[PDB]
Design a protein around this nucleic acid. Structure first.
Ligand SMILES: NC[C@@H]1O[C@H](O[C@H]2[C@@H](O)[C@H](O[C@@H]3[C@@H](O)[C@H](N)C[C@H](N)[C@H]3O[C@H]3O[C@H](CO)[C@@H](O)[C@H](O)[C@H]3N)O[C@@H]2CO)[C@H](N)[C@@H](O)[C@@H]1O
Ligand SMILES: [Mg+2]
Ligand SMILES: [Mg+2]
Ligand SMILES: [Mg+2]
Ligand SMILES: [Mg+2]
Ligand SMILES: [Mg+2]
Ligand SMILES: [Mg+2]
Ligand SMILES: [Mg+2]
Ligand SMILES: [Mg+2]
Ligand SMILES: [Mg+2]
Ligand SMILES: [Mg+2]
Ligand SMILES: [Mg+2]
Ligand SMILES: [Mg+2]
Ligand SMILES: [Mg+2]
Ligand SMILES: [Mg+2]
Ligand SMILES: [Mg+2]
Ligand SMILES: [Mg+2]
Ligand SMILES: [Mg+2]
Ligand SMILES: [Mg+2]
Ligand SMILES: [Mg+2]
Ligand SMILES: [Mg+2]
Ligand SMILES: [Mg+2]
Ligand SMILES: [Mg+2]
Ligand SMILES: [Mg+2]
Ligand SMILES: [Mg+2]
Ligand SMILES: [Mg+2]
Ligand SMILES: [Mg+2]
Ligand SMILES: [Mg+2]
Ligand SMILES: [Mg+2]
Ligand SMILES: [Mg+2]
Ligand SMILES: [Mg+2]
Ligand SMILES: [Mg+2]
Ligand SMILES: [Mg+2]
Ligand SMILES: [Mg+2]
Ligand SMILES: [Mg+2]
Ligand SMILES: [Mg+2]
Ligand SMILES: [Mg+2]
Ligand SMILES: [Mg+2]
Ligand SMILES: [Mg+2]
Ligand SMILES: [Mg+2]
Ligand SMILES: [Mg+2]
Ligand SMILES: [Mg+2]
Ligand SMILES: [Mg+2]
Ligand SMILES: [Mg+2]
Ligand SMILES: [Mg+2]
Ligand SMILES: [Mg+2]
Ligand SMILES: [Mg+2]
Ligand SMILES: [Mg+2]
Ligand SMILES: [Mg+2]
Ligand SMILES: [Mg+2]
Ligand SMILES: [Mg+2]
Ligand SMILES: [Mg+2]
Ligand SMILES: [Mg+2]
Ligand SMILES: [Mg+2]
Ligand SMILES: [Mg+2]
Ligand SMILES: [Mg+2]
Ligand SMILES: [Mg+2]
Ligand SMILES: [Mg+2]
Ligand SMILES: [Mg+2]
Ligand SMILES: [Mg+2]
Ligand SMILES: [Mg+2]
Ligand SMILES: [Mg+2]
Ligand SMILES: [Mg+2]
Ligand SMILES: [Mg+2]
Ligand SMILES: [Mg+2]
Ligand SMILES: [Mg+2]
Ligand SMILES: [Mg+2]
Ligand SMILES: [Mg+2]
Ligand SMILES: [Mg+2]
Ligand SMILES: [Mg+2]
Ligand SMILES: [Mg+2]
Ligand SMILES: [Mg+2]
Ligand SMILES: [Mg+2]
Ligand SMILES: [Mg+2]
Ligand SMILES: [Mg+2]
Ligand SMILES: [Mg+2]
Ligand SMILES: [Mg+2]
Ligand SMILES: [Mg+2]
Ligand SMILES: [Mg+2]
Ligand SMILES: [Mg+2]
Ligand SMILES: [Mg+2]
Ligand SMILES: [Mg+2]
Ligand SMILES: [Mg+2]
Ligand SMILES: [Mg+2]
Ligand SMILES: [Mg+2]
Ligand SMILES: [Mg+2]
Ligand SMILES: [Mg+2]
Ligand SMILES: [Mg+2]
Ligand SMILES: [Mg+2]
Ligand SMILES: [Mg+2]
Ligand SMILES: [Mg+2]
Ligand SMILES: [Mg+2]
Ligand SMILES: [Mg+2]
Ligand SMILES: [Mg+2]
Ligand SMILES: [Mg+2]
Ligand SMILES: [Mg+2]
Ligand SMILES: [Mg+2]
Ligand SMILES: [Mg+2]
Ligand SMILES: [Mg+2]
Ligand SMILES: [Mg+2]
Ligand SMILES: [Mg+2]
Ligand SMILES: [Mg+2]
Ligand SMILES: [Mg+2]
Ligand SMILES: [Mg+2]
Ligand SMILES: [Mg+2]
Ligand SMILES: [Mg+2]
Ligand SMILES: [Mg+2]
Ligand SMILES: [Mg+2]
Ligand SMILES: [Mg+2]
Ligand SMILES: [Mg+2]
Ligand SMILES: [Mg+2]
Ligand SMILES: [Mg+2]
Ligand SMILES: [Mg+2]
Ligand SMILES: [Mg+2]
Ligand SMILES: [Mg+2]
Ligand SMILES: [Mg+2]
Ligand SMILES: [Mg+2]
Ligand SMILES: [Mg+2]
Ligand SMILES: [Mg+2]
Ligand SMILES: [Mg+2]
Ligand SMILES: [Mg+2]
Ligand SMILES: [Mg+2]
Ligand SMILES: [Mg+2]
Ligand SMILES: [Mg+2]
Ligand SMILES: [Mg+2]
Ligand SMILES: [Mg+2]
Ligand SMILES: [Mg+2]
Ligand SMILES: [Mg+2]
Ligand SMILES: [Mg+2]
Ligand SMILES: [Mg+2]
Ligand SMILES: [Mg+2]
Ligand SMILES: [Mg+2]
Ligand SMILES: [Mg+2]
Ligand SMILES: [Mg+2]
Ligand SMILES: [Mg+2]
Ligand SMILES: [Mg+2]
Ligand SMILES: [Mg+2]
Ligand SMILES: [Mg+2]
Ligand SMILES: [Mg+2]
Ligand SMILES: [Mg+2]
Ligand SMILES: [Mg+2]
Ligand SMILES: [Mg+2]
Ligand SMILES: [Mg+2]
Ligand SMILES: [Mg+2]
Ligand SMILES: [Mg+2]
Ligand SMILES: [Mg+2]
Ligand SMILES: [Mg+2]
Ligand SMILES: [Mg+2]
Ligand SMILES: [Mg+2]
Ligand SMILES: [Mg+2]
Ligand SMILES: [Mg+2]
Ligand SMILES: [Mg+2]
Ligand SMILES: [Mg+2]
Ligand SMILES: [Mg+2]
Ligand SMILES: [Mg+2]
Ligand SMILES: [Mg+2]
Ligand SMILES: [Mg+2]
Ligand SMILES: [Mg+2]
Ligand SMILES: [Mg+2]
Ligand SMILES: [Mg+2]
Ligand SMILES: [Mg+2]
Ligand SMILES: [Mg+2]
Ligand SMILES: [Mg+2]
Ligand SMILES: [Mg+2]
Ligand SMILES: [Mg+2]
Ligand SMILES: [Mg+2]
Ligand SMILES: [Mg+2]
Lengths: 49, 272
RNA sequence: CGAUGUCGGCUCGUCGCAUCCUGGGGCUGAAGAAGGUCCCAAGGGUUGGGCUGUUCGCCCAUUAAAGCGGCACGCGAGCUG
RNA sequence: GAAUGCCGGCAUGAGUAACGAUAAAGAGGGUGAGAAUCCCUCUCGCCGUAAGCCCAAGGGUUCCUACGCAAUGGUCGUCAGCGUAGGGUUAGGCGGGACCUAAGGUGAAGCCGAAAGGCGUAGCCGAAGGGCAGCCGGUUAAUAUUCCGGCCCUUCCCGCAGGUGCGAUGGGGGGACGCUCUAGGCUAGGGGGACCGGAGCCAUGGACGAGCCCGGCCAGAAGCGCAGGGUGGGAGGUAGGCAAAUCCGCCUCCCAACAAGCUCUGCGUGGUGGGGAAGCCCGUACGGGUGACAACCCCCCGAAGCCAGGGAGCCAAGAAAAGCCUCUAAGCACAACCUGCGGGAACCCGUACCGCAAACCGACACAGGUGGGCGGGUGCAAGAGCACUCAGGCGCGCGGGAGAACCCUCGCCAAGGAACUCUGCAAGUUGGCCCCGUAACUUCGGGAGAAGGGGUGCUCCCUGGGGUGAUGAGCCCCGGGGAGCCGCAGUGAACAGGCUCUGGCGACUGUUUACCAAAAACACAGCUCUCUGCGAACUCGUAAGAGGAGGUAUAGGGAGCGACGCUUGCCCGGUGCCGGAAGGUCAAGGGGAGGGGUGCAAGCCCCGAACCGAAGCCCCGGUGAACGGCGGCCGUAACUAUAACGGUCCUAAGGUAGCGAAAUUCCUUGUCGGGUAAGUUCCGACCUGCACGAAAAGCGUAACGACCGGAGCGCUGUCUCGGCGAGGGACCCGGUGAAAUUGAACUGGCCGUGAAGAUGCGGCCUACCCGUGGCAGGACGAAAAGACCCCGUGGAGCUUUACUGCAGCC
RNA sequence: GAGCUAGCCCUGGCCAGGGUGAAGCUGGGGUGAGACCCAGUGGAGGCCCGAACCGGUGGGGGAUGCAAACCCCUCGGAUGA
RNA sequence: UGGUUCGUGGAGCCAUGGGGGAAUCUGGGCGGACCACCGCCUAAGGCUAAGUACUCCGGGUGACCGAUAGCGCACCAGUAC
RNA sequence: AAUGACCU
RNA sequence: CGCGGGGUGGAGCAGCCUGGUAGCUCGUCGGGCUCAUAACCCGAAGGUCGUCGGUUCAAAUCCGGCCCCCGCAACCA
RNA sequence: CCGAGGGUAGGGCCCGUGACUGGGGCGAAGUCGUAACAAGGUAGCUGUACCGGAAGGUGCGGCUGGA
RNA sequence: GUGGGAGAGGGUGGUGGAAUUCCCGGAGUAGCGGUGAAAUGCGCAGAUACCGGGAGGAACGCCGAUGGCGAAGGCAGCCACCUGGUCCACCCGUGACGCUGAGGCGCGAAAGCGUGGGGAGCAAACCGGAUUAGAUACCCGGGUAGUCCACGCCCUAAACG
């Protein structure tokens, strides 16, 4: 059947990107938490040009 | 007149379509004056706030003239009468000698080629606009302003009118389509005649689809729902309500008057 | 009750006798024939349809007879639902 | 030592199930340590509206090559989408960005919010939409619309040359638009040819023949030719297009009325360029040479594509902005602008490879999911259907035997033909086209493919229309008539309704429980009730604000009913809602009669009755397509039976029409009648309606229904009652090799006994040791800390005239 | 978290081929003029048959599956809600 | 209304959303309703070290662990997945 | 402000 | 089987709970109006209160045991 | 070739029968009321509509077969 | 044919006043409605009676007749338009063109049906208050369809002279 993962580079970027997270206090805290944690990747790596 | 069909299909046996014979050879509209992009959307910034809206034909807005006092004294020739997707009525395309082209909402009896004009001057004829004062008591009228210089707001639906009843210092009394008795300021413009397309009420949609074409989504009964959804939801195999009938939001829907009492508008109203 | 699947049908059977038939017998208000009634006897047999989820039952057509009951109201790690 | 404990390790089932579609394999020859599995050749099978091809998404090195097989591959592996290394992705013209706007996002001004933040006209951002200049070939192991060849374009900048008032983010025009059906002419694509070109081939009885086989194309500027799209030309007046305008708009006169003229596309043709089979020979994993100085011609079919902004009809009435054209304002008119021609300038990002899949989403080389374009030939009425088949790609990454039970999928059957069974569940019959031929009923459409029938191949003869063509040959579409041949059988294979009768429910097409319910439930037009006068009601939000609606009573919100036909009674006592400037009650507040505590006193501070006080409730009315309700007991007719009639109690009123053992009937298989040999079901009636009933509508209703019930015909493996055969598994051999479960086991029957159902206790009986294929009665078998039931002063969803608050409203 | 699912908004795309034959148009007929009736043309429809395509009706298989919804046969819709 | 031990209590003091609304030393607040008396303070502007809290970081020590422990990480870990 | 058994 | 409501003249109903009096309507009987009947008018009669027990000075009434009458309930399995 | 007839399928008319149901005719002295005929005690009759155990009543219009 | 005449003949548009009902203001009290008699009902929440203003629908007093017009049904305030039948005079024109009429077609009171509009009064059904033995009737108070309009049906009558 159709499963739940339907990859889209634009969606992933607009949805979970560094700039989206930065836009709101909710998201800014996510970066803070991930930084303090020592996460190698703050936001998902969306590729291609 | 109303177009009628033979039952060559079920739902074609009741279905019924407007007569478009008053639609003069001018079916597609007029750029310049209108259209605008019209912005379909069944809801506010976010959430739906009027249920069951959506779908249905794309539309172009015809930006019509609801304040006729710009062109006081300037007459215009009625050039055409065309279909307007965004109202029950039809619209008149008129050419002002000025050059400017406006649409007026099209009254009953309006003929193409006719002369029409607005102002204190203005022969009392179908199509003309006047401040309510100079209009003879008892004449039927439409596109009436509520307060002066604020635009036509009463009687624009197809086949509607108001009748002038009497006067009272600065106000003339109106009898509105609903039957209400209203004091409306003398200085309010209103155009003589009834609205026309009066056979609008006689049309039978005929099937479900037609409803959808006009963007009317299926309306579901409270009875059909559940207690979480509606006061009428549940219980077992059908149910008669079990309380005084209500909206989904709990207010009673048979009888409960809802106009706020202390409206300052009150001292200008005399009926139902 | 940290689970014994619960009606009926099907399939496969098997046992008890307080025997429906068939075999033996006493009495009979047993002429004969056919019955009644009791005692011995389970070795084998104990039909096909209509209605009902039906068990049961009531019919239709038969039959020597169309037996009653147990086996977790036998049988779902066998089916049916 | 136990916690269905936790992490880890190793066992059991077990060489057991399985090895992922039943499209299929066989051989010869290579390479190699090792070949069913790698390479090559011959044969066979499968796909072919794909299982072929080209894009987009996603993926990200999987592409190519060299060297390799530990692991990954469900077996093997010399092979690989795997390991190691190296190579490979070339653009002004393709796509995206130095262009535009959509929803939406953001947001200067502005508004709002305890804070965080929320809105928000302009502007910006935002694309499978608009705009914009490359076509055909050749090359690499791997890239090419990118490199190269030929042919053809577009932007800038600097020049010269020739024109003109040039000139804006501003005015206008244009861009610019639906759906259905469509004309004319073209192109893509395809069929045929005695014609042109071509290696070649006479086979096995015949054929050296208009014999077989292969191929007869592609691009192409100007200039033409043919199709078609856009569009009127003047002159005045002017108050609108938010400054101006010669532009546009409106008005009036002339001239065209036409594509005549300007243009602008498309298609042919075009200088010229390129390509160019079968077969044969070769050595590649593959390509090369020759065939060739290849030929490159004539017909026919022909689009859904092009000319495109074509045409007709319809109602539900069908984006925006830039480019572009034009107008003028500031300015400037040595600038600038247009046209021609030369030289110069033309960046950034993507380009590999997979892409209906072993490279994407499904943990997997997963029988699932994935948008667009091409998708040839022949026949079958047509077609993207079906059968076979070009091109091209596959035989699905375990094989080998055997020929049991059983299961799966499949074929056939005596005689009977639903006796099967909850039910004809399943399977069968029926089946395409043409022509006959069709009932009740009906809303006049339907019902209808009703039902029931006949024809259907091939050959020869005569003959009617068209299309392309000159009015002709052919070539291509539809027909009619007559003879005759073959077989059991002519839509000879594949694709392709069983039918009727009568009820229940819902009018209908539709929708729903993704993953057990597709329905009589939801929706539906349509009917009524009710709210709403516009800053509407209502909804969302603390607000600003937005929806409603750029709507205005023929409109919008809410509610119930649910096409249609005939209809929808009685009760306003209770509850609700609506209407009542009286009255009763009624909080804060007003008012202070009166009293209290202190002070030597002025005073200061407390209570506090009258009386004046809102909504709300009480009270008076209204209203049932508002919540709802719509009786009991006696007696009576000149045979009995029964009761039109009467008495009486009660109510707010005592159920009317129509239906009625019903999706409703307990007693109940009610009692009659019909279908049956027989009918707890079904149909028609009777009414004793436990417990129908009129918008939670009542009684009907043609049509419709993968809905539910009853019946009959047809036809059958459903059955009597099974039988045989087919293939895939099951079994045997080789290869890889799980799982749930598992206190430990040396794990028999009976009659007992025991926590009341024992392999384990007692007595007796039986029984050599160990497997293999099978069957499921048992191990209260596995699986899930029973769903039901109760318990807990456990938890949630829901309700209301439970309590108590809160929003909201008054 | 709306990359699954539900609704709506913006912008594109897709729907082989067959049937039935509404309005209208045109001709003939009828009338004082009509209504209307015949042909012919025309091509409407939550119309019919049936691929793609969207579904999921019944039965069987599958149940440590190919698959945490699949497969075969059969079936509904297929110019429209 | 909040704050204080103070939950409306005899409920003061301190802060304050709403209403009314003074005074400048013979002026004002407070000492738990209130009044008298005796006393204590000087509101409606602001700043001000140190003593105090914490441990990303460095150092020292341990009747603290010794790789199923000790931080999740002794090992290129907030990594693989 | 109702009614008047049957035939004659 | 459980529950709670009910038996009163000839008929239909009151009267009980706050024990001592049984009342309303119809019917029956006698008289009148009428030619007669009914309607109407005037008079009159009529009640072991289902039974059995006793609580009391006294029971239709209050309390127990039976008997018929009506209504409700009979659920999860 | 046609063809009597037999067969199958479907229509058309006509007759008989059917639980039950509708009204009707007729049958000396059963029931309920009083509709009509005298202004029949509400003039009657009437077409239609609604209602009522029953005659009947009422609304609307009409008639003289009433003053 | 020419010239005239009377008419509530028909269709459309417009308009007038009297009265009833409802609303508003004023003034005003203790009752009003109604019947054979009453009661239901309305009224101290300010009724009936009276005055001023407004709204609305329907029907047209006197003229009016024992009258007129029409084929019938039927037609009545006034105004204008469109429009049929008819009477007289003159004897001008045509020249037998005539009468009737199966079927057909058209019209056709009231009640009734469909769609939308309107609804003051009246009023089937319905609810009451009386009357009666009982009243589903007569009488009284309320009251809905309907009565009114547009369009489309229905086709009846003591449609009668
Ligand atoms: N009589 C013919 C038609 O039927 C009905 O008439 C029938 C009945 O109504 C009528 O019944 C009458 C009754 O009305 C009258 N008041 C009392 C009488 N005893 C009855 O009489 C009837 O029954 C008895 C026995 O049963 C028979 O013997 C007698 O013949 C018969 N007429 O008897 C008739 C039967 O014969 C209509 N009323 C009458 O008007 C109509 O025209
Ligand atoms: Mg919002
Ligand atoms: Mg948002
Ligand atoms: Mg609904
Ligand atoms: Mg529900
Ligand atoms: Mg609720
Ligand atoms: Mg129910
Ligand atoms: Mg409910
Ligand atoms: Mg248990
Ligand atoms: Mg256990
Ligand atoms: Mg014995
Ligand atoms: Mg004997
Ligand atoms: Mg036996
Ligand atoms: Mg059965
Ligand atoms: Mg049993
Ligand atoms: Mg047995
Ligand atoms: Mg038992
Ligand atoms: Mg059992
Ligand atoms: Mg079941
Ligand atoms: Mg232990
Ligand atoms: Mg473990
Ligand atoms: Mg093996
Ligand atoms: Mg085993
Ligand atoms: Mg095995
Ligand atoms: Mg195996
Ligand atoms: Mg495989
Ligand atoms: Mg094939
Ligand atoms: Mg790699
Ligand atoms: Mg490779
Ligand atoms: Mg290699
Ligand atoms: Mg391997
Ligand atoms: Mg594998
Ligand atoms: Mg090797
Ligand atoms: Mg590699
Ligand atoms: Mg740059
Ligand atoms: Mg940009
Ligand atoms: Mg925008
Ligand atoms: Mg914006
Ligand atoms: Mg914002
Ligand atoms: Mg932009
Ligand atoms: Mg684009
Ligand atoms: Mg481009
Ligand atoms: Mg390549
Ligand atoms: Mg080039
Ligand atoms: Mg210029
Ligand atoms: Mg512009
Ligand atoms: Mg030979
Ligand atoms: Mg060819
Ligand atoms: Mg060319
Ligand atoms: Mg200007
Ligand atoms: Mg070549
Ligand atoms: Mg066009
Ligand atoms: Mg812009
Ligand atoms: Mg590439
Ligand atoms: Mg490529
Ligand atoms: Mg691949
Ligand atoms: Mg594809
Ligand atoms: Mg594979
Ligand atoms: Mg796959
Ligand atoms: Mg995969
Ligand atoms: Mg797909
Ligand atoms: Mg093909
Ligand atoms: Mg073909
Ligand atoms: Mg075909
Ligand atoms: Mg195919
Ligand atoms: Mg057989
Ligand atoms: Mg046979
Ligand atoms: Mg048969
Ligand atoms: Mg049977
Ligand atoms: Mg049987
Ligand atoms: Mg059946
Ligand atoms: Mg079947
Ligand atoms: Mg039928
Ligand atoms: Mg349905
Ligand atoms: Mg489901
Ligand atoms: Mg279905
Ligand atoms: Mg299902
Ligand atoms: Mg309806
Ligand atoms: Mg708004
Ligand atoms: Mg809006
Ligand atoms: Mg509405
Ligand atoms: Mg319903
Ligand atoms: Mg009702
Ligand atoms: Mg009430
Ligand atoms: Mg009530
Ligand atoms: Mg009341
Ligand atoms: Mg009130
Ligand atoms: Mg007070
Ligand atoms: Mg006070
Ligand atoms: Mg004192
Ligand atoms: Mg009050
Ligand atoms: Mg019955
Ligand atoms: Mg029977
Ligand atoms: Mg049968
Ligand atoms: Mg029978
Ligand atoms: Mg029945
Ligand atoms: Mg019932
Ligand atoms: Mg019901
Ligand atoms: Mg109802
Ligand atoms: Mg219904
Ligand atoms: Mg039906
Ligand atoms: Mg359907
Ligand atoms: Mg269905
Ligand atoms: Mg079988
Ligand atoms: Mg077999
Ligand atoms: Mg086999
Ligand atoms: Mg042993
Ligand atoms: Mg035992
Ligand atoms: Mg033992
Ligand atoms: Mg032992
Ligand atoms: Mg074994
Ligand atoms: Mg076992
Ligand atoms: Mg087994
Ligand atoms: Mg078991
Ligand atoms: Mg178990
Ligand atoms: Mg438990
Ligand atoms: Mg539990
Ligand atoms: Mg408790
Ligand atoms: Mg979505
Ligand atoms: Mg089609
Ligand atoms: Mg068609
Ligand atoms: Mg036609
Ligand atoms: Mg369709
Ligand atoms: Mg279909
Ligand atoms: Mg179809
Ligand atoms: Mg396609
Ligand atoms: Mg679905
Ligand atoms: Mg199954
Ligand atoms: Mg299908
Ligand atoms: Mg506190
Ligand atoms: Mg406090
Ligand atoms: Mg307290
Ligand atoms: Mg304050
Ligand atoms: Mg203070
Ligand atoms: Mg103080
Ligand atoms: Mg102090
Ligand atoms: Mg103190
Ligand atoms: Mg102090
Ligand atoms: Mg200070
Ligand atoms: Mg400080
Ligand atoms: Mg240690
Ligand atoms: Mg550790
Ligand atoms: Mg260690
Ligand atoms: Mg750790
Ligand atoms: Mg009598
Ligand atoms: Mg007599
Ligand atoms: Mg006699
Ligand atoms: Mg007497
Ligand atoms: Mg339960
Ligand atoms: Mg008959
Ligand atoms: Mg009488
Ligand atoms: Mg009378
Ligand atoms: Mg009478
Ligand atoms: Mg009448
Ligand atoms: Mg009546
Ligand atoms: Mg006249
Ligand atoms: Mg007054
Ligand atoms: Mg003469
Ligand atoms: Mg005649
Ligand atoms: Mg009539
Ligand atoms: Mg009438
Ligand atoms: Mg009407
Ligand atoms: Mg309607
Ligand atoms: Mg009245
Ligand atoms: Mg009387
Ligand atoms: Mg009355
Ligand atoms: Mg009616």
């Amino acid at each position: 059947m159709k499963r739940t993962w339907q990859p889209n580079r634009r969606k992933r970027a607009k949805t979970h990107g560094f700039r989206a997270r930065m836009r709101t206090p909710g998201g800014r805290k996510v970066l803070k938490r991930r930084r303090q944690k020592g996460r190698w990747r703050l936001t998902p790596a969306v590729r291609k040009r | 007149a109303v177009k009628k069909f033979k039952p060559y299909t079920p739902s074609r046996r009741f279905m019924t379509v407007a007569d478009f014979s008053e639609i003069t050879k001018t079916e597609p509209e007029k750029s310049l004056v209108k259209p605008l992009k019209k912005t379909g959307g069944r809801n506010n910034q976010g959430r739906i706030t009027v249920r069951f809206r959506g779908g249905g034909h794309k539309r172009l807005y015809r930006i019509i003239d609801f304040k006729r006092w710009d062109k006081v004294g300037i007459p215009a020739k009625v050039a055409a009468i065309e279909y307007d997707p965004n109202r029950s009525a039809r619209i008149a395309l008129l050419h002002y000698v000025d050059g400017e082209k406006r649409y007026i909402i099209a009254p009953d009896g309006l003929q193409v080629g006719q002369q029409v004009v607005a102002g204190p001057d203005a022969p009392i004829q179908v199509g003309n606009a006047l401040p309510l004062r100079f209009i003879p008591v008892g004449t039927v009228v439409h596109a009436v302003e509520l307060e002066p210089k604020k635009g036509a707001k009463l009687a624009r639906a197809a086949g509607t009118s108001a009748q002038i009843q009497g006067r009272e210092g600065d106000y003339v009394i109106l009898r509105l389509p609903s039957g209400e008795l209203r004091k409306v300021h003398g200085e309010c413009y209103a155009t003589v005649g009834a609205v026309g397309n009066a056979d609008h009420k006689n049309i039978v949609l005929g099937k479900a689809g037609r409803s959808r074409w006009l963007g009317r989504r299926p309306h579901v009964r409270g009875a059909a729902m559940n207690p979480v959804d509606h006061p009428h939801g549940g219980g077992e195999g059908r149910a008669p309500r079990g309380r005084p009938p209500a909206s989904p939001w709990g207010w009673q829907t048979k009888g409960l008057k809802t106009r706020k009492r202390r409206k300052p508008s009150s001292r200008f109203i005399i009926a139902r």
